[PDB]
Amino acid sequence: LESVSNFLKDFLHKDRDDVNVEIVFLHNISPNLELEALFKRHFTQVEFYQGSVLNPHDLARVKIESADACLILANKYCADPDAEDASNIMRVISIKNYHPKIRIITQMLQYHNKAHLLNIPSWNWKEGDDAICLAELKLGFIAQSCLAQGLSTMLANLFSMRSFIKIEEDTWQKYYLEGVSNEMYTEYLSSAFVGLSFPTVCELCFVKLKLLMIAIESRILINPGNHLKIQEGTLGFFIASDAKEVKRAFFYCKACSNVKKYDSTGMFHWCAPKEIEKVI
Amino acid sequence: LTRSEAAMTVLSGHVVVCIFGDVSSALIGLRNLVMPLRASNFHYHELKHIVFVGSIEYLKREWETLHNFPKVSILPGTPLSRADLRAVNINLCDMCVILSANQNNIDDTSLQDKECILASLNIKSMQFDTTGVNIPIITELVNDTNVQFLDQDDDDDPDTELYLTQPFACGTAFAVSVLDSLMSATYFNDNILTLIRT
Amino acid sequence: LVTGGATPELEALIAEENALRGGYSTPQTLANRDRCRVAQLALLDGPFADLGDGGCYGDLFCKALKTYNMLCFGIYRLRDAHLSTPSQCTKRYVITNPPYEFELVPTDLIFCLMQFD
Ligand SMILES: [Ca+2]
Ligand SMILES: [Ca+2]
Ligand SMILES: [Mg+2]
């Protein structure tokens, strides 16, 4: 009940644009009366079918061969993280075995189990297979709070879909909620901005269109320098109130030395393998 | 062995044995697998080398019955470690054999063959300067219904019998459930059990 | 942004060997350092400090972006800084992407992405 309720609140939020993607649930337990009521409150957008993901007959029943993606939620509060990871690995194996070319989004509790999973022959991270590793992302968010305190809160609030909430009281909560009302989006931007610098289109977009750009599509570039020119046909990683606002970014045309210091890729510092007693 | 000596010791036409042992796992009895390879109607130059990859605790809980055989080696690693399987020359073996001891301790009928399936997929998803799909591989499964995950090109159906499944018809999978006809065969013909045994 | 880069090369290396391996310095290695790093900076000193009491977030956003190639996605504002009375509380909170018209106070911190040297 809580897993589906939280998923449907984020998937069907009014701040996204007018998407009409149907949601089909596959589970081997008959839903209780409160889940049946939750599906009745979403009667035109949610369907449930009772079956096992490990059964090719059930996979054909839910028409997984024509689905746009398959999402595999995980039990974050399970007693045995290893057992939960093994079960999720088996589910991924079964889905890929039935249909190798299905986009799979899954939650993985540990990082070694994520490494175990990515060895699957059909597991293609380029095609869109995303293993959202909870321990990895949470420890990365904690580390970014060590570079700038509050950044874990800053990042987490950019994903959850939230409407504007306003109250008459002058309290820190009003300002906080006003800040929380913005999410990170992604869309293609006008030919009227091709040929300009990234700082220039940022100061243009900032309050005239009311849109802030963090990055653009040498592909994924976090906060480009002043020396980079906007390619034709590119997309911007906007932060905005919603998706219907970032449409402006498109719909505008002048409407006014042998030391090994690093890893093999040159992205992390490195040293020789220290003994445990040396660092104790 | 370890990583260094395994990698520099050239191996080809060998047998690689992948064991998911544990300190609490049951004894597989690897003697019965080694002895047929070690039989004397092969010349000594024709004896395929054997290397075991698995938990060092489980290897030191079974080595007490394998010290009188030649051409054997242990590598104390993980059967799912890509580095170990590359160091063991997995692409040049005459067989890879995948066995699991943790099959009776747990009762889930879903995770019994998870390790074996994952190891098989990891070996089949290897790039060699040829792919890992052409490697000679055999794996032992506890549940016959888990055989559908071994191959991807084949069509899968739970109703289809194990003998009819493609990975078994190719000699890629083996389960102890196919031996149940030996009761009836043995009874009707008393010499069949000794002909098979020899 | 979160793991400080994990390009497909590193994801292959950690999948094959399951450890970071050290590399000798190369021109491509020294080019791979150029990517932005997240920062906080103070509003009480340095070139930004003329945005004292009553400054506009739009002025700060504009001058930071124009002159230091730097832009801010939020303010780490003190909880009690909106009150009239002084307080000993040092707790702050994240304000995300505020209006151009949004009002500054001199005790503030700014979240931003900054260049590499
Ligand atoms: Ca919003
Ligand atoms: Ca199959
Ligand atoms: Mg419907």
**Can you read off the two tokens belonging to residue B71?**
């051409």
Question: A158 vs A5, A11, A141, B30, C74, CA distance in Å?
Answer: 20, 14, 13, 56, 12
What angle (nearest 5°) sits at the alpha carbon of residue A28, between those of residues A24 and A29? 105
- Residue A144 is labelled as binding a ligand: no
Q: How far is the CA of B144 from the centre of ligand 3 (A)?
A: 37
From chain A, the residues in CB contact with B158 under 8 A are 55-57
Q: Three-state SS for C54?
A: coil
For chain A, say whether B152 makes contact (Cβ under 8 Å): yes
Question: C91 vs A31, A149, C79, C80, C108, CA distance in Å?
Answer: 45, 11, 6, 8, 11
From chain A, the residues in CB contact with B117 under 8 A are 93
Binding residue ranges of B for Ca(2+): 148, 151, 154, 156
Q: Do the chains contact at B121 and A120, CB–CB below 8 Å? A: yes
For chain A, say whether C41 makes contact (Cβ under 8 Å): no
Smallest CA–CA distance from B127 into chain C, residue: C16
**Can you read off the two tokens belonging to residue A111?**
């990082």
User: What single-letter amino acid sits at A14?
Assistant: K
Smallest CA–CA distance from B157 into chain A, residue: A56
What angle (nearest 5°) sits at the alpha carbon of residue A213, between those of residues A207 and A218? 155
**Can you read off the two tokens belonging to residue B102?**
């943790």
From chain C, the residues in CB contact with B81 under 8 A are 18
Q: Smallest Cβ distance to A97: which of B80, B114, B148?
A: B148
User: What single-letter amino acid sits at C90?
Assistant: T
For chain C, say whether B81 makes contact (Cβ under 8 Å): yes
Q: How far is the CA of A70 from the centre of ligand 2 (A)?
A: 19
**Closest to B113 measured CA to CA, from A122, C16, A89:** A89
Binding residue ranges of B: 148, 151, 154, 156
CA distance A277 to B139: 42
Resolution value, angstrom units = 2.9
CB contacts under 8 A, C 8-27 vs A, are 9-11, 13-15, 18, 20-26
Written as one string, the DSSP assignment of C67-82 is HHS-EEEEEEEEGGGG
**Beta strand spans in A33-170 (E):** 46-50, 70-72, 104-108, 130-133
The alpha-carbon gap from B126 to the nearest alpha carbon of chain C, in Å, equals 10
Q: Identify whether the C-beta of residue A229 lies closer than 8 Å to the C-beta of residue A221.
A: no
Question: A127 vs A104, A179, C5, CA distance in Å?
Answer: 10, 34, 20
Q: Smallest Cβ distance to B122: which of A90, A94, A119?
A: A119
For C83-104, b/e burial (b = at least 16 CB within 10 A) is eeeeeeeeebbbbbbbeeebeb
The pairing of strands A46-50 and A23-27 is parallel
CB count within 10 Å of CB A26 equals 18
From chain A, the residues in CB contact with B157 under 8 A are 56
Q: Identify whether the C-beta of residue C56 lies closer than 8 Å to the C-beta of residue C104.
A: yes
What angle (nearest 5°) sits at the alpha carbon of residue A203, between those of residues A198 and A209? 110
- Residues β-bridged to residue B17: B52, B97
Q: How far is the CA of B161 from the centre of ligand 2 (A)?
A: 13
Q: Do the chains contact at A222 and C36, CB–CB below 8 Å? A: yes
The alpha-carbon gap from B179 to the nearest alpha carbon of chain C, in Å, equals 39
CB contacts under 8 A, C 55-114 vs A, are 58, 61-62, 65-66, 69, 71, 73-74, 76-77, 79-80, 82, 92-100, 111, 113
Q: Do the chains contact at C16 and B86, CB–CB below 8 Å? A: yes
Return all residues near A217 (Cβ < 8 A) that are at least 6 apart: A231, A234, A235, A236
Q: Do the chains contact at B157 and A120, CB–CB below 8 Å? A: no
Q: Do the chains contact at C16 and B83, CB–CB below 8 Å? A: yes
The alpha-carbon gap from A79 to the nearest alpha carbon of chain C, in Å, equals 27
Question: C25 vs A11, A272, B158, CA distance in Å?
Answer: 46, 15, 56
Task: Please give, one letter per residue, the 3-state secondary structure of chain B.
Answer: CCHHHHHHCCCCCCEEEEEECCCCCCCCCCHHHHHHHCCCCCCHHHCCCEEEECCHHHHCCCHHHCCCCCCEEEECCCCCCHHHHHHCCHHHCCEEEEEECCCCCCCCCCCCCHHHHHHHHHHHCCECCCEHHHCCEEEEECCHHHHHHCCCCCCCCCCCCCCCCHHHHCCCEEEHHHHCCHHHHHHHCHHHHHHHHC
Q: Identify whether the C-beta of residue A207 lies closer than 8 Å to the C-beta of residue C65.
A: no
CA distance A177 to A165: 6
CA distance A75 to A108: 9
Q: How far is the CA of A268 from the centre of ligand 3 (A)?
A: 50
Q: Do the chains contact at B156 and A56, CB–CB below 8 Å? A: yes
Identify the residue among A210, A262, A274 best suited for mutation to test binding to C, counting C beta carbons within 10 A and taking the highest: A262
CB count within 10 Å of CB A57 equals 13
CA distance B96 to B133: 12
From chain C, the residues in CB contact with A115 under 8 A are 14-15, 18
CA distance B71 to B34: 10
CA distance A113 to A136: 12
Smallest CA–CA distance from A177 into chain C, residue: C95
CA distance A131 to A116: 11
CB count within 10 Å of CB A257 equals 5
Q: Do the chains contact at A202 and C99, CB–CB below 8 Å? A: no
Q: Identify whether the C-beta of residue B137 lies closer than 8 Å to the C-beta of residue B123.
A: yes
Q: Is C112 exposed, middle or buried (0-12, 13-18, 19+ CB in 10 A)?
A: buried
Return all residues near B167 (Cβ < 8 A) that are at least 6 apart: B147, B150, B151, B154, B173
CA distance A262 to A268: 6
CA distance B30 to B48: 16
Q: Smallest Cβ distance to C74: which of A119, A172, A179?
A: A179
What angle (nearest 5°) sits at the alpha carbon of residue B132, between those of residues B102 and A96? 65
